[PDB]
């Protein structure tokens, strides 16, 4: 095993660590709170309450059945809103952790090609794929670029796994955000 | 605010100053092992503005706040409607920043046409009355003053030294800004229609009543304090202006003055539109 | 922190070609040779341990940068370490290396940063990978900073020259006979080129030889029928670009009619203050019955009847044109025509003493640069008087009693001249050394002057650079695992003081009951 | 690297102040704005006394370890405790509540005054130094001093203290009063290394804090 894969054998690895501490943390300050688990059940219970309202409305519903959807759009504006500043909480604190994740790569993996590329990268994404790297041959892996690939890819799928992923109704209202 | 806090950097010829008066004090604090020393000289610094000239500032500043709310309150009723009772204040900075203003318009008028005249026609008997310009470069960045004449006259004392120094100048400059000041707080009044006779017209056309008093009693009670309102208030200002520059107020005390008063008409006009 | 200064290897191109180092600024992490992983760290080297191949694979491994350490003794080094790095600093030169490279005279700050460098290096293979991580924890780290900037070309460099003349008893149309030699030191470190021997040992030569005939000319019974011509050439290491210019200036221009057709010979001396063996270099050999030939035979009757420790011997090579740098300085004469030979000590131009920092005043002996000195003045005498034609015997030295060689004298010139770095790129016009020369040179020659050669702007045949000296700063710093498990020595303390106040009742509730019983007892 | 350091020595000041407000209740009372009150009436206290001591003590010259000027400024940090006093004053509730706003707040200020510009600067340097981990303990030590502080203002303010507990809170007062500047004089004469020095301050703390203690549940006693 040369020292090229078993970077990135260990960069994969601490991608992997890497999204099960940010999932820890959103645990942690999010999902355990009270005031997580209340606006979430809200915010789908809203959520199923006005697509079933709306199925059932036809055009005969009347002003005020109309201004009682509004109303329910707007309850359910303010409790997304609310549940974005909660999640936001996580994800500043992932920003930090992110900032102590990079002082660490640096500090293993500073000048080193971690992955070769089987492609040419497109000039606009060269400045991450081949950052930080000596070297003309733009199919030189970045750790950066390698771990933002395997962060974007495990994240989702682990969140997937544990039920931690955001409803798609909450990702559907979020969309408003 | 920026003599207050500026990070810029004035070569004194000792060392490098922040012209700041926090900045500096605190870079002082923080690289002067003689802390004590470091603040006293920033509080008494010669060359850069002082963080006792910030204090005489702020006390300057609460006492301008303090006379501004001084007022003489009239109580108006409602003639249409019983028991609305209103109170009509009469300021005692009744004629404002004006006078303060005009005065200081003047004089900057008499400075520029006395420099251009000294600078044109040198020697001539009226200008040297006018005035006459020296320029001091006294380690400091250069400042033109009027060493003789009117000009010289109304020029301020830079300082209580001084003040000791040429006594009668300060006598004669404290006596001409007061007299000014109350000359053009009446002038102002009669020509601003803010008399007596003109805010009991306007009260008969808000149909706002005195108590007890005809429309003309109003205006003869009106009459009765407007006019000592405004020069009294002219007085105070100019000899609030006086003490403040005395006390070397950072901005002026004519400055400190005119942004007190600018600010709180202005805080008056947003809390009535509100 | 610990500040130390860091001469930083030259920067140079010489008839377009790219020498020496690219970079002047370093970031890095310190570590010696024996780490696994140099790749943008500071490699530091003791000269004593320093080797020509662990060079070569710090290159390889891409070093951030490296660090010569020198012994603050360049006597007290031993002969064969030193010996090893002359013969290594011609291919260093050579070599364009991106990596920069940087000499440090020793401290005991430096030295003992060195060793904790060392000992953090070799920790890592010889323990367990816990052990491993709980040494690198305590360990203390040490971060190289240099406080330059990169370096910059300088457009506009002068070389200065400075020729001075005395003439024989029938004027300008006498044979005029030219003593050069070059000023310049060159090593891999502009600020240690010292140059003793190379070429303040010429210099030294070349102004004793001045001395003695400005003494002759003064007084007419002594006064010779030659004019003589002393040049210290600026820019010698570098093509002799100021012997190249004066040659242009005295030959191209007809007014200057001396060169022209009365140029008997040029004598040049190069490394001159060493060795029994002296070598003359000559691009052709003498014809006989010219008068380099007769220079050619009262020097080696001289060297065989006086001086018999000392072996004389010719060599000739042919100028090679396709060559971008000239073996010697003789051969730009004999390019333009003039008949010209080189006296060295050194057998080979390619000797690493030539071109080295190591060529140090110790290195010099005085008693030998002073027989070569007298060798040198009497067969000079001796073609200029005729000598051997009157019958005058080659045993017989015409400089001694009131013309003897002044040992002191020549003792303090070189040390006036190692006392301070000679390298071109150092040497300005203004500076304190050619002030001096000039001075020197002009109390016993007339008409001394100076020439001044610039590099082409649109085809500059030499470029020099600046950042030549640095300060370099040494961090102490922690690593990133010693962060986190501080980190997580914090997240513990926190959680300990959490449940310390949250338990704060029942320490109130202790105390209370103590205060009670205290009480009632 | 330095962003480890800082981010470390910033969580170790900071999060044991927050620990302390949540646990104290004091976010239950709503108490923020009257410990923003408190660090305001720190800042003025600290401006006057900074005023003081350059208006009436000139520096001393000499080389030699100015006892009268550590001496002085223990002197001048009386001001501290009539702060203290003044913020207890304006502030409603229970005693416990009051002194642990006043020293909450005081504290608070104190750190974001001396302790953060230094914490940003230094800790965010190249170099790694134990100085800015000392400081965050130092910083938690003066927490707790300021506590015990408030506790002894409020002890000595209380108008039903027995005559015979007033000598032992003054004592106490007096101690906490001139303790920088006992151990300033202590580590200066003693050479003490940083940790020495650190360990020594914290030591002391914790036995001001004891006693204060023993001697609050003693008065509270003597009432129930």
């Not at chain 2, 005395?246 to 002026?252: D, E, K, P, V, Y």
């Not at chain 3, 070309?153 to 008893?169: K, M």
């Not at chain 3, 000079?380 to 003897?404: A, C, H, S, W």
Request: glycine share 6%; proline share 3%; aromatic share 12%.
């Amino acid at each position: 095993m040369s020292t090229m894969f078993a970077d990135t054998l260990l960069i994969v690895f601490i991608s992997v660590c890497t999204a099960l501490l940010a999932e820890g943390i959103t645990w942690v300050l999010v999902y355990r709170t009270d005031k997580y688990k209340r606006l979430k059940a809200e915010v789908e219970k809203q959520s199923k309450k006005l697509e079933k309202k709306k199925e059932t409305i036809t055009e005969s519903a009347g002003r005020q059945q109309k201004k009682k959807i509004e109303r329910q759009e707007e309850k359910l504006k303010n409790n997304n809103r609310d549940l974005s500043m909660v999640r936001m909480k996580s994800m500043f604190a992932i920003g930090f952790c992110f900032t102590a994740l990079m002082g660490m790569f640096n500090s293993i993996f500073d000048g080193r090609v971690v992955a070769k590329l089987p492609f040419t990268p497109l000039s606009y994404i060269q400045g991450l794929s081949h950052r930080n790297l000596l070297g003309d041959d733009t199919t030189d892996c970045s750790f950066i670029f390698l771990y933002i690939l395997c962060t974007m890819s495990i994240r989702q799928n682990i969140q997937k796994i544990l039920g931690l992923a955001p409803s798609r109704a909450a990702t559907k209202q979020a969309g408003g955000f | 605010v920026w003599k207050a806090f500026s990070p810029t950097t004035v070569n004194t010829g000792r060392g490098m100053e922040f012209e700041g008066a926090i900045i500096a004090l605190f870079h002082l604090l923080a690289t002067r092992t003689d802390k004590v020393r470091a603040l006293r000289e920033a509080f008494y610094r010669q060359n850069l503005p002082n963080l006792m000239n910030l204090i005489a500032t702020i006390f300057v500043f609460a006492v301008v706040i303090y006379f501004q709310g001084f007022r003489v309150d009239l109580p108006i009723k409602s003639a249409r409607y019983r028991g609305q009772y209103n109170t009509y204040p009469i300021k005692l900075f009744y004629t404002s920043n004006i006078p303060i203003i005009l005065q200081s318009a003047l004089v900057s008028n008499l400075y520029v046409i006395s420099q251009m005249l000294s600078a044109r026609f040198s020697g001539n008997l009226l200008v040297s009355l006018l005035g006459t310009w020296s320029d001091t470069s006294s380690g400091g960045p250069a400042r033109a003053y009027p060493v003789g004449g009117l000009c010289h006259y109304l020029s301020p004392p830079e300082s209580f030294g001084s003040v000791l120094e040429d006594p009668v100048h300060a006598v004669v400059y404290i006596v001409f800004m007061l007299g000014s000041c109350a000359f053009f707080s009446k002038t102002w009044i009669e020509v601003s229609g803010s008399s007596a006779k003109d805010v009991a017209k306007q009260l008969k056309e808000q149909q706002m009543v005195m108590r007890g008093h005809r429309e003309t009693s109003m205006v003869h009670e009106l009459n009765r304090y407007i006019p000592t309102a405004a020069a009294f208030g002219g007085l105070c200002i100019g000899a609030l202006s006086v003490l403040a520059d005395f006390l070397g107020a950072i901005g002026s005390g004519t400055g400190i003055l005119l942004a007190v008063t600018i600010i709180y008409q202005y805080f008056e006009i947003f809390v009535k539109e509100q | 922190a610990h500040e130390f200064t860091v001469y930083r290897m030259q920067q140079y191109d010489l008839q377009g070609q790219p020498y020496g180092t690219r970079n002047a600024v370093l970031n890095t992490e310190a570590r010696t040779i024996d780490a696994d992983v140099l790749s943008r760290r500071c490699v530091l080297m003791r000269l004593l341990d320093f080797s020509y191949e662990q060079y070569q694979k710090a290159l390889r491994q891409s070093a951030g940068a490296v660090v010569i350490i020198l012994p603050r003794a360049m006597a007290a080094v031993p002969q064969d370490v030193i010996r090893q790095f002359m013969e290594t600093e011609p291919e260093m030169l050579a070599m364009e290396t991106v990596v920069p490279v940087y000499f440090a005279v020793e401290d005991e700050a430096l030295l003992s940063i060195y060793e904790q460098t060392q000992a953090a290096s070799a920790a890592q293979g010889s323990a367990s990978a816990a052990e491993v991580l709980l040494h690198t924890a305590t360990a203390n780290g040490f971060q190289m900073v240099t406080s330059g900037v990169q370096s910059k070309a300088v457009s506009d460099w002068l070389i200065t020259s400075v020729e001075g003349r005395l003439t024989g008893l029938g004027g300008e149309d006498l044979p005029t006979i030219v003593i050069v030699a070059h000023y310049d030191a060159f090593g891999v470190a502009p600020w240690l080129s010292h140059g003793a021997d190379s070429n303040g040992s010429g210099i030294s030569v070349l102004l004793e030889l001045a001395r003695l005939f400005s003494r002759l000319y003064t007084y007419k019974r002594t006064h010779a029928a030659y004019n003589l011509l002393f040049f210290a050439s600026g820019g010698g290491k570098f093509n002799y670009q100021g012997t190249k210019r004066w040659l242009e200036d005295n030959l191209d221009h007809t007014d200057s009619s001396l060169l022209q057709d009365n140029v008997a010979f040029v004598l040049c001396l190069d490394t001159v203050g060493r060795g029994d063996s002296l070598h003359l270099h000559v691009s052709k050999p003498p014809r006989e019955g010219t008068l380099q030939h007769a220079f050619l035979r009262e020097l080696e009757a001289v060297a065989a009847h006086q001086f018999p420790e000392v072996r004389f011997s010719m060599v000739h090579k042919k100028i090679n044109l396709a060559e971008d740098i000239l073996a010697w300085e003789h051969e730009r004469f004999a390019i333009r025509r003039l008949p010209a030979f080189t006296l060295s000590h050194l057998e080979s131009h390619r000797d690493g003493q030539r071109s080295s920092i190591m060529d140090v005043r110790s290195r010099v002996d005085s008693k030998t640069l002073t027989r070569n000195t007298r060798l040198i003045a009497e067969a000079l005498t001796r073609v200029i008087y005729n000598l051997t034609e009157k019958g005058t015997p080659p045993d017989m030295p015409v400089f001694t009693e009131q013309m003897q060689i002044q040992q002191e004298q020549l003792d303090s010139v070189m040390d006036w001249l190692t006392n301070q770095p000679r390298a071109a790129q150092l040497v300005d016009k203004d500076g304190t050394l050619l002030s001096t020369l000039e001075h020197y040179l002009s109390r016993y020659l007339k008409e001394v002057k100076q020439h001044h050669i610039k590099a082409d702007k649109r085809d500059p045949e030499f470029v020099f650079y600046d950042q030549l000296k640095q300060v370099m700063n040494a961090y102490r710093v922690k690593p990133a695992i010693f962060d986190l498990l501080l980190a997580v020595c914090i997240g513990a303390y926190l959680g300990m003081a959490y449940t310390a106040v949250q338990h704060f009742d029942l320490l109130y509730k202790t105390v209370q009951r103590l205060l009670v019983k205290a009480k009632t007892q | 690297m330095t962003l480890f350091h800082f981010g470390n020595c910033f969580a170790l000041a900071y999060f044991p102040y927050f620990i302390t407000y949540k646990c104290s209740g004091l976010s239950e009372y709503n108490a923020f704005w009257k410990c923003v009150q408190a660090g305001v009436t720190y800042l003025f206290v600290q401006l006057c006394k900074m005023l003081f001591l350059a208006t009436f003590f000139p520096t001393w010259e000499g080389g030699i370890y100015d006892f009268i000027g550590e001496f002085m400024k223990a002197s001048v940090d009386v001001a501290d405790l009539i702060g203290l006093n003044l913020v207890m004053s304006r502030n409603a509730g229970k005693g416990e509540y009051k002194i642990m706003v006043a020293a909450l707040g005081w504290a608070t200020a104190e750190l974001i005054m001396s302790r953060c510009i230094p914490l940003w600067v230094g800790a965010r340097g190249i170099e790694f130094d134990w100085k800015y981990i000392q400081m965050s303990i130092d910083s938690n030590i003066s927490l707790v001093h300021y506590i015990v502080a408030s506790a002894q203002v409020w002890m000595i303010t209380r108008y039903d203290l027995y005559h015979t507990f007033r000598p032992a809170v003054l004592l106490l007062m007096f101690l906490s009063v001139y303790k920088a500047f006992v151990m300033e004089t202590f580590v200066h004469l003693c050479s003490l290394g940083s940790w020495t020095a650190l360990l020594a301050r914290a030591v002391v703390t914790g036995l001001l804090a004891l006693s204060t203690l023993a001697l609050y549940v003693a008065v509270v006693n003597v009432h129930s």
